[PDB]
Amino acid sequence: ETKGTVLLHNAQEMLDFSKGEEKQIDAMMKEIADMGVECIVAGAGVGELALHYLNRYGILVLKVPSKFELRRLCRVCGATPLPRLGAPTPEELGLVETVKTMEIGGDRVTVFKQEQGEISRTSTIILRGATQNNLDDIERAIDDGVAAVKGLMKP
Amino acid sequence: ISPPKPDTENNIIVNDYRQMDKILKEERAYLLNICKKIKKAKCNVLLIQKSILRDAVNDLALHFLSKLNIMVVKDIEREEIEFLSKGLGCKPIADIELFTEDRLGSADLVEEIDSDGSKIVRVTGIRNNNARPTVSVVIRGANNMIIDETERSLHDALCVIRCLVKERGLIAGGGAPEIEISRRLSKEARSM
Amino acid sequence: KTSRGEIIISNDGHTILKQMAILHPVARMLVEVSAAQDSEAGDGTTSV
Amino acid sequence: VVFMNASQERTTGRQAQISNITAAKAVADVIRTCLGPKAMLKMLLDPMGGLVLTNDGHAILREIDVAHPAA
Amino acid sequence: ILIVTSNQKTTISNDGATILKLLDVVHPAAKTLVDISRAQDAEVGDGTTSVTILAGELMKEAKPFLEEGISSHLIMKGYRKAVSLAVEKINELAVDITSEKLERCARTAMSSKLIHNNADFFVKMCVDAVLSLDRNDLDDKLIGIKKIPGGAMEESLFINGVAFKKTFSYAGFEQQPKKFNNPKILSLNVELELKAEKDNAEVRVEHVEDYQAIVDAEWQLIFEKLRQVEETGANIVLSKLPIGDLATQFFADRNIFCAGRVSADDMNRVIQAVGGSIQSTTSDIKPEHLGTCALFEEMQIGSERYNLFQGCPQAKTCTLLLRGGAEQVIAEVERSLHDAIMIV
Amino acid sequence: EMGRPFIIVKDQGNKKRQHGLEAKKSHILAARSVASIIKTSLGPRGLDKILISPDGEITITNDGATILSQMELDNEIAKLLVQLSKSQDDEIGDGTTGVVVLASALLDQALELIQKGIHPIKIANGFDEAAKLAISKLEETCDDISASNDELFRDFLLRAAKTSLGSKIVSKDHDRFAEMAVEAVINVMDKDRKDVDFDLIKMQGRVGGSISDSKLINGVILDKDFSHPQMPKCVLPKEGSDGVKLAILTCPFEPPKPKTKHKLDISSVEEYQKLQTYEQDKFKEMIDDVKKAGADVVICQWGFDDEANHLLLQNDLPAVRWVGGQELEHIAISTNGRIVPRFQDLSKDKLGTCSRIYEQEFGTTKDRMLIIEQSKETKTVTCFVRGSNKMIVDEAERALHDSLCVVRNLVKDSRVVYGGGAAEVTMSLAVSEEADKQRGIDQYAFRGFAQALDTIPMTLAENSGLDPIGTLSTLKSKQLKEKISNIGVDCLGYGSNDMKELFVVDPFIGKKQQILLATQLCRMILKIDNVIISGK
Amino acid sequence: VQIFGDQVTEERAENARLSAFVGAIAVGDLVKSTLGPKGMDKLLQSASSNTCMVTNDGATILKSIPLDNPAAKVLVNISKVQDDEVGDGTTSVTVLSAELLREAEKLIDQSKIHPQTIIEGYRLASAAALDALTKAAVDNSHDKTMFREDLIHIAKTTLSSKILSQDKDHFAELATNAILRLKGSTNLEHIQIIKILGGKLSDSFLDEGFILAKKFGNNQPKRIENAKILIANTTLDTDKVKIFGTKFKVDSTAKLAQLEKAEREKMKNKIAKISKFGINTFINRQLIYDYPEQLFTDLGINSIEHADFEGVERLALVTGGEVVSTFDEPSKCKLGECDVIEEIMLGEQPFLKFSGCKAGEACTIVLRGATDQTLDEAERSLHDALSVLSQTTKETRTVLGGGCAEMVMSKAVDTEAQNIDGKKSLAVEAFARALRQLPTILADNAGFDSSELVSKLRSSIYNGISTSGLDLNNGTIADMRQLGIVESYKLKRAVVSSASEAAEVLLRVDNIIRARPR
Ligand SMILES: Nc1ncnc2c1ncn2[C@@H]1O[C@H](COP(=O)(O)OP(=O)(O)O)[C@@H](O)[C@H]1O
Ligand SMILES: Nc1ncnc2c1ncn2[C@@H]1O[C@H](COP(=O)(O)OP(=O)(O)O)[C@@H](O)[C@H]1O
Ligand SMILES: Nc1ncnc2c1ncn2[C@@H]1O[C@H](COP(=O)(O)OP(=O)(O)O)[C@@H](O)[C@H]1O
Ligand SMILES: [Mg+2]
Ligand SMILES: [Mg+2]
Ligand SMILES: [Mg+2]
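YS: structure for the whole thing
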């Protein structure tokens, strides 16, 4: 966090500096691939050197900016985030049967949809419409129905 | 005269707290050894040209030359070094190792005259081997307009002697050459 | 009186012509005539 | 073109009915204190400078310039 | 319709979606025709003009109803009920047509727009364009088309792979052969040149003897990444990051083609064209990750040289090179081709 | 209006809308203003035009692509004709003035059909069908010259060269320009007479002297002189030699330093004294690697410090400084050398070979320029043009540039036609004959396309002071009596309207694009209805 | 329908052809009175700083005066090329190219001649004009005595049109010897021109040596005999080594004083290697500080600082030496030799004068003038004379001047006009009448007759005498071989070629388009 700088005293340390960083990500990403993790959710920008070994084992990469977007992802699969890059705990790993990418409104969207077993929470509703103005109030119209469900709990 | 400051950027790194004591002792020792070699040649007057980048004389070195009774003058124009070299017959000293007695000039009396709220340094007498002596004249006056014109009046006076020494011989002024040439030409103009 | 805060009182014709700007090109050459007399000789530059 | 030069924009519907009722009520609200034996007085300033001080209903209305047409 | 914006950008479009994008509509209700034009163009791509004409007519026929005593919701009851029976009527109009096995539908999509009279030619390329895309994928980038100003639109031809612009002139470019009999394309994210390596540059050297080894070490590390490419026999090297003249000249003596500055969207088409893979480091390069094709030839089109990828047995990339006199001519043709591919 | 402001689009009052017949009349008259400008410069009797730039620079040319490029316009229809000639110059490079006259001729005949009630699409549909009938007719009339050997093949290149050199300033030297333009392709070309590389020929202009001093020089012409000019200007090879062993280096002469920012800390006087010896050892090592390789002239991209001025002077090694990166590619091609990245990779096999390296004095002062010559046929040909005016040196570049565009098009196989208006007349009568067989609503469409092709021969008679009626009637009556298509308009008036005796030859690929660019552009213009132009 | 934007001026009609021809008339009439030895100088009023410039050369007059007419810019560019190529004849090209448009204006208006016909008429007319000068060219280079004498007569003709026509007899030898010193070198940057204000104009002299305006730094004597001159380009002041990544890591200032002292040891060791040559004088183009200058005092070596790089090449050719860096090897390095070196003073500024130098490949010219306007004119007057004589060493062919060369070319033009027939005969004969204007204007500036005097020169050539010419002093016909009026053959071809090509420019412009200024 303070004054990150490359220190090379002699040419001997410079020759092994290029191959040294490649072995660090390789050693860290190997423990994740050995656990059978086919998808990794990231909360910030991922360097290109880290994305290389993820494509070697066929591991998907997801970008989750800000906070609330990533917070509701773990409620679907039942996972516990951890800051370190080491091998995650098998008890903290989530379960998602299929991940699909198809064209809906002209752009590529990722499908987190769950199935009958291993049920998930915080489901989403795809809303299709011709005009964006109708899409705004129907979103608030659905929220009125969601708020009506809250009235079935406290009383 | 100052602590060492090479033109190339230098970095002084202090590893041990005891090194800070030796640094302050060597900085004054570097300026002391320079002043010790000046006293060996019995040089009581030092002239320093205008300084660029670091200062000409450090305040720490002022105490060295003051206790030894040595007059120090700095901020001298670089173009005036040629006049001071031939005028006083003193060979300039650009290195403390090349500083010697033979390169130093000589003067009978060196005194700074302070009068009417104005200070001026004058040298009385010159003793040396010189084939090109110099001269200096102090100009006074009421304001800068009169003083500048007093000097401009001297330029026209110094050029009169320059024309006589360069070209030997002179004529009579006051209207003599204007009427004489006009008369001698009028006689020849009728014959053409 | 110069355009700046400096003021010069001079009887020398060259100094007069130098500090006095002229808008006529041929009359500007009279300034250079006084410079030719002052550089080579230095006396009688107002007579030329 | 501009078509009609007089009020090409129009205020119709309930907006015109409210403006007629509200302005008509404001005419009666100022004279509410002018009714009864304890009624107060009202002073009027004309552009000529003559002062008229009375509790009479008509003398107050005719000397006041109302910009509202229906009022 | 000829429309010139405040930036003096000439655009000629009959499309209901493009016309409404040029003009800036500040009217709240008039912007609803813009949403339905962009929504129709996003999914199907055709009919954007017919939707706006039909939507505006429904409001025109409802104009005399509003002047009467008909309530606002009573009018919407008629449109919502009639559209329910109209969608079911379209299913009766349509036919399963599992018999007869793209040709007819691509000709009708070009109508009202340029090159429609040329449909005896451009339609043949529209058929094989989407057929290269496998089911459940149907990538919208792999059908990407490049526009070349100048020339005639009838001189266009079909290419089995992506063609990109060089955008930069290399000092060792001409020394590299432009004709390959059996090229091997290698996609790399590495940056080959003399520069600071990772995110920071500082060097501390006390002795002059060790100062010479620091310079020689920098040349060996850059050349080490260059030797690993030559040992694998890769004839073509593509990179997103810049490539200096040091790596370009090294590939010139080995008869290896070098390229850089290519956009991220173009190299995504390279992986699908030659069936290769992206390698972000030079130490992991393996022979089975290199793609190839039948031949590689660099042809100059309108004072612009492009790299031609063609002849691959299986390629999902389709890139067309369009020509035309006006800058809008090359835009209108792709605008017709982009809308015609979404129909098939 | 109902009393409230009605604004659909921002900047309502700023933008204007054109529709109806007034919108079509404004588009046709916009092309007529551009046509009448280009029609005056069409043909060898045409005249140039002055182009004043906003920065004060002037340009004198008859080229329709250059005139319209620097032309500041307003109407967008006239701006579409700018890229029309630009489309002709970028690809083919010939006939930029003919595509503007032919396109406006199609619009002039279309305006008469619009007033008769014909739908604009029906007009565009008739021009597309008539364009393919004219190309297929002229394709059958031309013959293949590829059967001739290389001796006669050079003659056909001289025929089409003299035609493109006309109509432009400094047309008196076209006899020598035609010879020098063909020899550039003779030296640089493929052995199969196909797909010649044009980028290997560079156009380098020089301002001074006279036009008679223009000659071909195979090699590299640089604006930089020899560094430290105490060395002889003209470099000569050794008695016996394989060549001059020209060296090319992209690395300046300096002691090795890391690309990254470095800090060299000297903690003692002994470490500082070693840097003094280490400094002079590198400048002595760099000059020895060139002497051991046998190289003579050294080329540096970034130059070198004054230390090596006398060092390379002792070994008699010429050197240049601050050579551009684009010029380094031009140097290695001429001498067939290889750029050496560093002294450790320097070898005798990577050195270039050229005949002689020398500089010319040119004028009085000016600047010093280096010239390289080749001893045999190479892949580099540099054009050398001189002139007494800055405008002459400029236009002569693009004048020979367009001449090279005609020769490289003849490299393509089996496409040749004869110019002088003979192509437009042959294709005009073929379209008018089909109009009688088709009839229908499109009968008037083929007539408008036939009358538009005759405008080019009639324009040639205007600049030559002839009668366009009597000239066109003679050409049409000749094609009906005999099948020879070689009769055309003569603006030089040497007689013999046969193009075979006058040697005038034009590329068919150039004439084919003139019809395609004119017909396909008018198809888009006739479709324009609403014209929305925002205020500047 | 207006396709052009706002504030766009264009003339598609007679107004364009009228503005193009009249635009060249004002340019030709401006430099018309400057042609000939009797011509008058022009005055230039600067828009800033109020700096007046008086020059007879037409190249400076056209470039200084702003001209917005494209027809005028064509005549300005050909004058800049004529100055940069040959170095003389900028006014003759502008006048001759303007007269070609004068004769072409009456053919289009009155005679109704096609513009290209006038252009094609000058093509066959210029071929006979260039061939007429070839047969009239005499090569005297076979004899060094006759070639050196011709260099004097050429200088008298060039210096006659300038203010030096009175003293040109004294300045003809100074310009001739300066070219002989170059030994065939066409580079004029090797000759230095020092302008001194005051004194007689005839006091200008040419010394054998190199006169340097710079002086010795401090203690070096003014006059010294038998001094070896050395030239060093690089550094030798507070040397930075090379790389910028060097620093001094110092634990205590006791070691820092030894590091800076090592920098002075590097300076002392480098000056000690200079003394191994045995030179009495050292010269550095880079300025020298006080510490390295004092090291030359005990060695008796002179020191010179702040020498310009363009003067280094001039200085190296005078001493015949070699620029020397990397002093480690004395063998491969060469030094210059000089008999005596004395510091003189011309005016207020003292100068460094050299005498008895081995090599003469470069020299220095000193000029004297009453005003700076005459000094700026004296330098430009010699710059035009030294440029022709420099090109004469390359191409030694010469052609007589004084109106002779212009009339001889017109003799061959009238012959070819008969065989052409057509309507080009009016265009070919117009080129011959345009050649009459150059000798005619020579008589107009001298107050002579423009008809009978020209007819006497024309009738004398058709009688079989090709040596006849015009004499402006006596106002009659005189022999050019006896008067010594001759010019270089390259100057004759340059004026005819540049004017013929420039005339073909404006005659091809039917339309003039002016974009909105920026
Ligand atoms: N004592 C005198 N009596 C009469 N005339 C004099 C006397 N002194 C000088 N003059 C004349 O007056 C003139 C003064 O010129 P001056 O103003 O000195 O010129 P400048 O100032 O340019 O040197 C001289 O030319 C001289 O002839
Ligand atoms: N010397 C000539 N003889 C006959 N016809 C010519 C001649 N020169 C040009 N032309 C004709 O004039 C037309 C225009 O040529 P030009 O204006 O020189 O170049 P561009 O074809 O680029 O406009 C050509 O189609 C050609 O047929
Ligand atoms: N003594 C003389 N008698 C006759 N003619 C002369 C004499 N001196 C010069 N001339 C002529 O006057 C002309 C001067 O031309 P000049 O003004 O130098 O033209 P430019 O300025 O273009 O060089 C020369 O061409 C020369 O022939
Ligand atoms: Mg459609
Ligand atoms: Mg042409
Ligand atoms: Mg002259």
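YS: worth flagging: Residues 372-394 of chain G form the longest helix (23 residues).
IM: good catch. Also The pocket of magnesium ion (ligand 5) is lined by residues F 94, 164, 402 (CB under 6 Å).
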